[PDB]
Amino acid sequence: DVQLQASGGGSVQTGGSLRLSCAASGYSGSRYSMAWFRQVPGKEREGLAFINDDGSRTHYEGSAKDRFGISRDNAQNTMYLQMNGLKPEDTAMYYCAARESTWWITVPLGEAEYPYWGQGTQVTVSS
Ligand SMILES: [K+]
Numbered sequence: 001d002v003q004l005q006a007s008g009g010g011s012v013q014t015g016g017s018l019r020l021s022c023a024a025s026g027y028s029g030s031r032y033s034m035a036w037f038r039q040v041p042g043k044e045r046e047g048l049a050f051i052n053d054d055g056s057r058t059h060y061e062g063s064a065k066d067r068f069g070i071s072r073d074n075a076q077n078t079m080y081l082q083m084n085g086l087k088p089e090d091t092a093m094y095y096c097a098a099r100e101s102t103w104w105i106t107v108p109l110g111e112a113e114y115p116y117w118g119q120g121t122q123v124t125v126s127s
Contacts, residue, residue, distance in 0.1 A: 002026045002116040006096045009121030012086055018123060020081040022096030032098040034079045035114060036070065040092040047109050048094075049081055053102035059109075086125045093120035
């Protein structure tokens with residue numbers, strides 16, 4: 001019984017920043033490992049950024065390595081994606097996902113590794 005709520009999307013100018021949040025509700029004693037995925041128009045949904053239970057490991061896909069940051073606040077069961085230097089090509093539907101098992105050696109990259117998803121949040125970047 002895990003529920004995820006993604007928020008923080010909207011319209012932003014090219015060059016700007018946006019922070020997305022994903023809040024998990026689980027009464028259990030697990031700090032879920034979590035991820036952001038996005039689907040840009042015309043493309044398959046793809047992994048973007050990944051964080052384990054305590055934020056001791058992160059992984060970024062593509063230019064998120066240079067521009068984006070993922071973090072989490074385990075005192076309020078929320079993770080964040082800070083996107084800086086946004087470009088029109090970052091216009092997409094953004095999704096967060098969660099799984100019970102943590103990780104260290106191997107990043108769980110596939111969608112199938114995450115049983116729990118939230119509804120997407122649209123980000124639109126315009127010059
Ligand atoms: K990064």
